[PDB]
Design a protein around this ligand. Structure first.
Ligand SMILES: NC(=O)c1ccc[n+]([C@@H]2O[C@H](COP(=O)([O-])OP(=O)(O)OC[C@H]3O[C@@H](n4cnc5c(N)ncnc54)[C@H](OP(=O)(O)O)[C@@H]3O)[C@@H](O)[C@H]2O)c1
Ligand SMILES: NC(=O)c1ccc[n+]([C@@H]2O[C@H](COP(=O)([O-])OP(=O)(O)OC[C@H]3O[C@@H](n4cnc5c(N)ncnc54)[C@H](OP(=O)(O)O)[C@@H]3O)[C@@H](O)[C@H]2O)c1
Lengths: 253, 254
């Protein structure tokens, strides 16, 4: 009866993370959070007493404490925390940077999680649970106009390594899902791509779709689900890996 | 004349020593510094004269960043390098005692203030094929106890050096760590924030580092940051993260 908290579960990898979690087990309870009310009420209508949703922006700590205390006031237990919520904008070249937009990007993919763990860490230590970060391949690779988003996940990799080395009662990990057929790649192909992104990387993100090499949302979500359901191995605690790493072969579909 | 360099945090530690080395190897270089303490800046003005200019204020405000860049073009007409030597260690705290508002102010000094200054000066940096030098730290890769916000902010700055060097081929960015230097920050580690938020084993590593005379003088790494701004960043290490004593950065050593 593991209690798993997942962020941004209204679309993309988030909604599938709770979909795979409800497929491998029938006693696991998931507390989700997002900003769109319609797709979150559909998840509870579909799963009933196994899913509970909080509609709000993770940048507001008022709804972060709403998500954590609801799991304690509902089940008195906090096992896993999968940080699967983030934005991509601002997608802009270094010659056209808005710093206040960069902090807005950092307040969702990094500062939102540092505050989220600090609120749920006392409950996570009581179960010796796992903290799984949903990182990205842009933390060590160059991507055009991804200066904010690329360094966004690089700081998450450091926060994953620091958390695993500081409080060893819990275990932290940061795993990149690769390239997944979500609405983010839709934004890369039909909006922020032709505007500010270059030509070489753009035709790659679009050529990888027509030839059908884009992963479905449930392929990497199964890795984050099993890592949140069975636990993180000891030899990879705090490291940064990808979903298809041989060390995580026991978490593949 | 020669080149014009912009160095941040020219008050304490390494930032002041970078100014001393830049004037030590050249006589045409003029440095435009910025810092919040007027006491050590007005002293550097009377030591070098018309080779040094300063702006008193915090780098978190864009009005100070623009006042430093605009003064460098109305005075000498160009900007040839950028030395981002401004950082803060606090808040040092445990994961169970995290203050998010205090974590942001570190990022707004060590990261968001730098990414704001690079773009304001980017139109001038590209006109001279300049070199942007980032002063990072060893905490971007290794783990340090309770160095949560500091170690993670250097990791974001290192990625920005690679992004800046790959997007604008007219500029050259690098992120060099000075190792562990005998500055005012290491004094704060062994005495202030040490017996407060950090472990015991890592402090016996840092306090034993001073008792072993292993603390580098700020003259050694500042020479690497200064020579990289004068002679320029090589192409074989453009956008990478290195240390001061890297074999690729040997020609920038004293
Ligand atoms: N797709 C890829 O190629 C790829 C690659 C590398 C990493 N990732 C990472 O995988 C994770 C999910 O994939 P995705 O981004 O592609 O799916 P997505 O559909 O683009 O969005 C992911 C979720 O994040 C939620 N979210 C964003 N900001 C929020 C906020 N301020 N408050 C509450 N919820 C918020 C969104 O819910 P609402 O819309 O309702 O606010 C959304 O459901 C992301 O973290 C992404 O960085 C994806
Ligand atoms: N010393 C080491 O062992 C070590 C190791 C790794 C990396 N580093 C990095 O090397 C750089 C300098 O070394 P240090 O930290 O040891 O010297 P330091 O004695 O700690 O002084 C830090 C400098 O940054 C300036 N500064 C900080 N915030 C500022 C702001 N908001 N506006 C303007 N100036 C500001 C300070 O000037 P004011 O206080 O007057 O404003 C000061 O000149 C730092 O970035 C540090 O992260 C140092």
């Amino acid at each position: 009866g593991k209690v798993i908290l997942v962020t941004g579960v209204s679309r993309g990898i988030g909604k599938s993370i709770v979909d795979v979690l409800f497929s491998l087990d029938k006693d696991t309870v998931v507390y989700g959070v997002a900003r769109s009310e319609a797709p979150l009420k559909k998840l509870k209508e579909k799963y009933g007493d196994r899913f509970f949703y909080v509609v709000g922006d993770i940048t507001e700590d008022s709804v972060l404490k709403q998500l954590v205390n609801a799991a304690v006031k509902g089940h008195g237990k906090i096992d896993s925390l999968v940080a699967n919520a983030g934005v991509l904008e601002p997608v802009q070249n270094v010659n056209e940077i808005d710093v206040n937009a960069w902090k807005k990007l950092y307040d969702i993919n990094f500062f939102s999680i540092v505050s989220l763990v600090g609120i749920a860490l006392p409950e996570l230590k009581k179960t010796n649970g796992n903290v799984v970060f949903v990182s990205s391949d842009a933390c060590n690779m160059y991507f055009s106009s991804w200066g904010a988003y690329g360094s966004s996940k690089a700081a998450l990799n450091h926060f994953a390594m620091t958390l695993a080395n500081e409080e060893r009662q819990v275990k932290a990990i940061a795993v990149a899902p690769g390239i997944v057929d979500t609405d983010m790649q839709v934004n890369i192909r039909e909006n922020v791509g032709p505007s500010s992104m270059s030509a070489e990387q753009l035709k790659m993100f679009r050529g990888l779709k027509e030839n059908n090499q884009l992963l479905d949302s449930s392929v990497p979500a199964t890795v984050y689900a099993k890592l949140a359901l069975h636990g993180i191995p000891d030899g990879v605690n705090g490291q940064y890996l990808s979903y298809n790493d041989p060390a995580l072969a026991d978490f593949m579909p």
